[PDB]
Amino acid sequence: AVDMFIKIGDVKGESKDKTHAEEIDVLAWSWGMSQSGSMHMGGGGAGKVNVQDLSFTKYIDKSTPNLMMACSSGKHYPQAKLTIRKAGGENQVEYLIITLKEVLVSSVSTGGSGGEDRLTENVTLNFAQVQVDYQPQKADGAKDGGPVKYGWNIRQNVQA
Amino acid sequence: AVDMFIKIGDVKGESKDKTHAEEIDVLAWSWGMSQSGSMHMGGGGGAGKVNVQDLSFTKYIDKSTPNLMMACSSGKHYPQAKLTIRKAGGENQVEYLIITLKEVLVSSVSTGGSGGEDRLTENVTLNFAQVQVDYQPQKADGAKDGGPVKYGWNIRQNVQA
Amino acid sequence: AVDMFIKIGDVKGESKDKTHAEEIDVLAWSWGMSQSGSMHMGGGGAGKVNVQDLSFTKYIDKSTPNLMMACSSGKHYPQAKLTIRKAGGENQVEYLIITLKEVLVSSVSTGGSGGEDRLTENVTLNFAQVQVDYQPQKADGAKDGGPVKYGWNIRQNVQA
Amino acid sequence: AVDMFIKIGDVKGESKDKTHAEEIDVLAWSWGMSQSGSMHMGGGGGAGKVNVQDLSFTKYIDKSTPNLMMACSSGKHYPQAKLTIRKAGGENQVEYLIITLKEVLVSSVSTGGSGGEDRLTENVTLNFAQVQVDYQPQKADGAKDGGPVKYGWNIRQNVQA
Amino acid sequence: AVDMFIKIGDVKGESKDKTHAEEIDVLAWSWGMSQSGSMHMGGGGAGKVNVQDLSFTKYIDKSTPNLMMACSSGKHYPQAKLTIRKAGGENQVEYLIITLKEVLVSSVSTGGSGGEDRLTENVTLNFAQVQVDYQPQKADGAKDGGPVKYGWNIRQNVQA
Amino acid sequence: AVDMFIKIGDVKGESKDKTHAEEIDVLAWSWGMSQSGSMHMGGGGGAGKVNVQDLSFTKYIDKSTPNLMMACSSGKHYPQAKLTIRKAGGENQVEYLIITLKEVLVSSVSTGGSGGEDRLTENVTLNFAQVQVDYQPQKADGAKDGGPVKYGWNIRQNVQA
C-alpha cells in the first residue's frame, strides 16, 4: 500500500515518517474536476473547467485545532502539499505530488464512530492554484525520465 | 478503544467511570464546520463565513434522558457541556481531546429500541454559542508532549475565543 | 433483552405477560423531538419544540382491527402507556414508562414479507400530552431513589 | 410460515391449496392507512381524514397474469377480492386474517424475471372502494377464541362499513 | 431456470438455442403498467393505463451495433417477440410469449464492469401494441387448454 | 476476463500489453444512449432525437493522468480515442468490440485513493462529436465469423457516419 502525507503551511501533524516527519498522515483522499465544453455543437461549444476542493482523511492529531481555526477564521495558507509514495519506505519514489497554492480549509468533519482506537476526521481544502507531478518508473522501481506535469491557475483560469 | 464521556450542565448520567462517574457515557459522536470563503476570486475578495454544526452524540437511555427531554422542550440552555475523549487503558490515561461548549441548548433527542437490545440507545444533538477544543499531544511512551493545542471560537459573535 | 408492552385505551392485545396480560407486545419503538431555538443569535433566538409521533412495531393481533378503525374514524383514546421493563420477568423494574394522553392512531402499516411464522405491523400515535418516567436502579437491580420525570403538554406548549 | 392466498373476482390462478385451489398464491403483501388529524390543536379542532393505501402483493407469474393485465389496461373493476392468511399446518388451520375488498381495480402490474429463477414473480396493486378486515383470535391450543374482531370501512363514502 | 429469448425485427443475435437460433439470449427482463383510475370517487373516477417500455438484459453480441443504430435513427421494427420457455430444452412449453408491434429501441446501456468473461448491456423497447400469451400446463408438463391472452393497442387506447 | 484498453490522442499510458503497450489499461467502462421518440403517437408523428452519453472509464493513476487533467482544464480536444475490448487469452485473440471516438474532450477526471490500495484508481469521462462501434462475431472455435458489424453516428450533425 502507498504511503501518503500532507503538509499544510507550517502546521505540524504527528507523522513519524523518516522524511515526512511532523506532516499529517493521510488515510484517504479524493479530488476531481469537470469541463462544461461540448463537442456536439461544432462550428468552433466552449465551456469552462470546474475544479473541486480536495478532500482527505486523517487521524485527529495536533494539527486538528489549527485546521479548525483556519476554517473558522477563513485565513489561507500559502501552500499545501500532498505526497503519495510507493510502498516500501522513504527511499521509494514519490510518484504523485499535488501542490496547492493559496489554501483555505473549507471544512472539517470529525467524530468517533465507536470501537475505535484512533479517531479520524475529514478535511477539505479550497485553493487558487494546483500543480500535479507524476513520476513514471522503470520496471525495477527506478525513475523513468522526468516527471509528467500539470499546472492550473483556477483563480485566473489559465495554465500554470 | 478510546473512552468517551459528556457532562451537560449539572445533569447526572449513569457513567461508572472513576473520573467521570455520573456523567453520560458517549457511544459515538460527530461534529463539523465549513467555510463558504473561496480562493477562486482573488484581489482580496471572496470572503466567507464559518458555519459550525450542532454536536451529535449517542448515549444509552439513562437517568439523564428525561432531563435532556425537558431542556429540549423548554428551550432552556445549560451554562456548559464538556465532551472528554481519553486514550484506552483507564483513568490516568491522557484525556487528549476535550471539547467544551458554552451556552448549550439540547436541539434534538431521538430515542427508541428494538431487539434483542439489553440496553436501549438514543441520539442527542447540542447547539451552543461558543466552543473550545483542547488537544493534548503525547510522546511515544504516552507521556504528555508540551501543552495542549487550542482552538476557541465564539459562534455568536463570529470571533475567536 | 428488555420486555416491552403498550396499553392503548381499553383495547385488548394478546400479551401473555404475567402483569401486562392482554396488552400489546412491542417488538420495537422509536420517538423523538427537536427544538428550533438558536444559541448563535444572542441578545436574549427563541424557538419551539416539535414533538414527533411515537412509532412502534407489534404482531398482527386482536387489536389490529380496532387500531385500524381508530385510524379511519379519527377517534382518540384517553391514554396510551408504553412500558419498558428490564429483562427477567414481572418482578423486574419497569425502568422506562411513557404515557401519552389524547391519543390518535396516525398510521397503521401492515403486511407479510414472506417466510414469516408471525406477521408484524407498524403503528404510529399522535398525542396532546406526554409523560416520561425513568426509574434509576442500584447495582443489584433495586430501585435507586424516585423516578426521574419529564412531562409536556404539546397542545398548550407548557410543561405537565 | 403462514399460508397466503388471494381471490380476485372470478379470475383463476394456479394455487394447488386444498381450500384455495385456483386462487393466486401470495408470496408477500403490504397495505396501510394514515390519518391527517392532529391532537396538537385541541378545542374540538384539528380534525383530519383517513388515507387508505392500495393493497400490494407479490405472486408467481401464472394463468391469472394476462387477465390482471387486461383489467389494469381496461380500468374494469371486479366486484370483490379476498386475501386470506392462514396459520401454518394446512387447510383446517385457522384463517386468522381475512381482508375483503369491494369494487376492485388493478392499479398496477410490475412483472419480469432474472436468474436463475425457475419461477418468475410479479407485483400487483389493488385499488378499492370498501374494505373489511376480519381477525380471528385463538386460544393457546390453536382453537378459536370468541368470534372474529372486525373492521369495515367505506373509503368512497368515508364512513364505517 | 427458464430459458429466455428475444427476436427484434430481422436482427440476428448469437443464440445457439436449437429452436431460437440466432435470436438474442435474454438474461433478465422487466416490464410494467399502471392505471390512474380511482374507486374512491364513485358516481360512475375513470382514468387511463400507462404502459412502460420493456427492459431486457443481453450479452453484447452481433445485434449490438444494429440496436444502437435503431436507437439513434429512431427507426422502428415491425415486431419484437420475447419468449420465456420452461427449463429443459426446446421441446418444453413456451409458457409466456410477449409480442410487441411497432418497436422503437428507446435506450441502450452498455459497458464492462471488470472481471467479466462476457460483457452485458441493457436495452429498452417502446412499442405501439402488446400481446401477452400465457400457456397453462398440467402436472406432467403437458399443455392445459388454450393460452390465456391479453392484447392492447397503446397507440389507440383499446384492446387488441 | 476480457482485456480492455483505451488510446486517447497521442497520450501515453502505462499498459504493458504486447499490442496496446503505452495505451491506458481500462478497468471498467460504461456508455449509453437513449431515444425520446414514441410509438404511442402514430400517424407519422411522435418523432424524437437520440441523446448520446459521454463515455466513462476507470483507469489506474498513471503517466497519462496529468495530461488528461490538462485536457480537461484547457478544453482542448484530441482527434481520436479508441477503446478496444479483446477476448481473454492474449494478443492474437479477437478484438471483438472496438469503439472509436472522434473530436474528443476530457469531460471529467475524478481521482483519489484509500486503503490498502497498492495501485490508486481514477474515473475519466469523454465527450465526443462522432462515434464508431465495430463488433466482430466469432465461430464456435473462436475464428472470425464474417466481417465486423458496424455502427457509426455523427452526434454533432445528428446523422449516420
Q: What is the DSSP string of A25-59?
A: EEEEEEEEEEE---TTS-------EEEPPEEEEEE
**Mutate which of E22, E25, E68, E107 to test chain F, going by most F C-beta atoms within 10 A?**
E68
Q: Which of E106, E116, E155 sits opposite F35 (nearest CB)?
A: E106
Q: Is the dihedral of CA F110, F113, F117, F118 positive or negative?
A: positive
The H or E element containing residue E27 is strand E24-35
CB atoms inside a 10 Å sphere around CB F138: 16
Which DSSP category does E133 fall into?
Answer: E
Query: How far E46 CA sits from the closest chain D CA (Å)?
Result: 7
Cα(A100)–Cα(A129) distance, integer angstroms: 6
Distance in Å, alpha carbon of E121 to nearest chain D alpha carbon: 14
B73, C49: Cβ pair inside 8 Å?
yes
Non-local (6+) Cβ contacts of C52 within 8 A are C31, C32, C33
Q: Do E35 and D69 touch (CB under 8 A)?
A: no
Residue F91 cell numbers, joined: 494478443
Residues of chain E found within 8 Å of residue F123, distances taken between Cβ atoms:
none
Judging by DSSP bridges, how do beta strands D97-113 and D78-86 pair with one another? antiparallel
* Apex B67 CA angle, B61 and B72, nearest 5: 100
C-beta separation of B68 from B107 below 8 A = no
Cis bond upstream, residue D116 (ω within 30) = yes
Experimental technique for the deposited model: X-ray
Element (H, E) at D73: helix D65-74
Alpha helices by DSSP H, listed for chain F, are 65-74
User: In chain F, whose CA is at the least distance from the CA of E77?
Assistant: F39
How near does any CA of chain E get to the CA of F101, in Å?
15
Secondary structure element (H or E) that encloses residue A65, with its range: helix A64-73
DSSP C133-153: EE--B-TTS-B-SSPEEEEEE
Subunit contact E49:D73, Cβ cutoff 8 A: yes
Q: What is the resolution of this structure in A?
A: 2.0
Q: Which residues, in sequence order, are bridge partners of residue B45?
A: B42
Instruction: Kindly state the cell numbers that stand for A90.
Output: 522513504
Q: Please judge whether C71 and D35 are an interchain contact, meaning their C-beta atoms are less than 8 angstroms apart.
A: yes
Q: Are C74 and C104 in contact (CB under 8 A)?
A: yes
Q: Looking at the partner chain, which of A35, A37, A96 has a beta carbon nearest the beta carbon of F61? A: A96
Identify the CATH number of the domain in which residue D161 sits. 2.30.110.20
The neighbouring-strand residues paired with B106 are: B126
Residue D46 CB partners (closer than 8 Å, separation 6+): D37, D38, D39, D40
Instruction: Using CA coordinates, name the residue in chain C closest to B158.
Output: C40
Alpha-carbon span A101 to A125, nearest angstrom? 10
Domain that holds residue A25: 1-160
Q: Is the dihedral of CA B10, B14, B15, B19 positive or negative?
A: positive
Give the closest-approach CA distance of C65 to chain B in angstroms.
24
Nearest to F31 among E104, E111, E128 (CB): E111
- Residue of chain C nearest B77, judged by CA positions: C39
For F86-126, give the DSSP string.
E-TT-TTS---EEEEEEEEEEEEEEEEE-TT-SS-EEEEEE
- How far CA A126 is from CA of B41, E65, F58, F64, in Å, comes to 11, 44, 25, 25
**Residues of chain B contacting residue A54, judged by C-beta atoms under 8 Å apart:** none
Tell me which residue in C2, C34, C51 faces B117 most closely, judged by beta carbons. Answer: C2
- Cross-chain CB nearest to F33 (options E68, E102, E117): E68
CB neighbours of residue C131 within 10 Å: 17
Cα torsion angle, A14, A20, A24, A28, sign: negative
Is the previous residue joined to B116 through a cis bond, with omega within 30 degrees of 0?
yes
One DSSP character per residue, D78-140 reads EEEEEEEEE-TT-TTS---EEEEEEEEEEEEEEEEE-TT-SS-EEEEEEEEEEEEEEE--B-T
Contacts of A65 in chain B (CB under 8 A): 133-135, 149-151
Q: Specify the length of chain A in residues.
A: 160
**Chain B neighbors of A127, CB-CB under 8 A:** 39
> Does C131 lie at the interface with B, CB-CB under 8 angstroms?
no
d(CA D141, CA B28): 47
The residue assigned the cell 523518516 is: A18
- Cell numbers describing residue F15: 499498459
**Is residue B141 left, alpha or beta, with left meaning phi > 0 and alpha meaning psi from -120 to 50?**
alpha
Region of residue C67 (left: phi > 0; alpha: psi -120 to 50; beta: else): alpha
Contact E2 D113 (CB under 8 A): yes
Distance from CA of F92 to the nearest CA of A (A): 25
Using the beta-carbon criterion (under 8 Å), do C65 and D149 form an inter-chain contact? yes
Nearest to F2 among E73, E117, E126 (CB): E117
Show which of residues 39-98 on chain A sit within 8 Å of chain B, judged by CB atoms.
60-62, 64-66, 68-69, 71-74, 76
Dist. CA B70–CA B79, nearest whole Å = 16
Query: A118, A93 in Cβ contact below 8 A?
Result: no
State the best of D68, D73, D121, D128 to mutate against chain E, taking most chain E CBs within 10 Å.
D73
The three cell numbers locating residue A61: 492529531
Calculate ∠ Cα B27-C142-C83, nearest 5°: 65
Closest chain F residue by Cα to residue A57: F114
Report yes or no: B158 and B49 within 8 Å, Cβ to Cβ: yes
Q: Given CB atoms, is A138 within the 8 Å cutoff of chain F?
A: no
Give the chains touching C; criterion: ≥3 Cβ pairs < 8 Å: B, D
Interface check A7 vs B, CB under 8 A: no
Position A130, amino acid:
V
Contact B154, B95 (CB under 8 A): no
Whether C93 contacts C85, CB under 8 Å: yes
Secondary structure element (H or E) that encloses residue C70, with its range? helix C64-73
Across the interface, whether the CB atoms of C40 and B156 are under 8 A apart is answered: yes
The answer, for C156 touching chain B at a CB cutoff of 8 Å, is: no
Alpha-carbon gap, residue C147 to C98, rounded angstroms: 12
- Chain A residues with beta carbon closer than 8 angstroms to that of F62: 134, 136
DSSP chain B: --EEEEEETT-------TTTTTSEE-SEEEEEEEE---SSSBTTB----EEEPPEEEEEES-TTHHHHHHHHHHTPPEEEEEEEEE-TT-TTS---EEEEEEEEEEEEEEEEE-TT-SS-EEEEEEEEEEEEEEE--B-TTS-B-SSPEEEEEETTTTEE-
User: Would you list the DSSP string of E66-115?
Assistant: HHHHHHHHTPPEEEEEEEEE-TT-TTS---EEEEEEEEEEEEEEEEE-SS
Give the nearest partner residue to E30 out of D52, D65, D112, using CB atoms. Answer: D112
Which residues pair with residue B5 across a beta bridge? B25, B84
d(CA F1, nearest CA chain A) in Å? 25
C21 to chain B, any CB pair closer than 8 A? The answer is no
C39 and B127 in contact by Cβ < 8 A? yes
Residue type present at position D39 = M
Cβ neighbours around B142 below 10 Å, total: 12
| Number of domains, chain D | 1
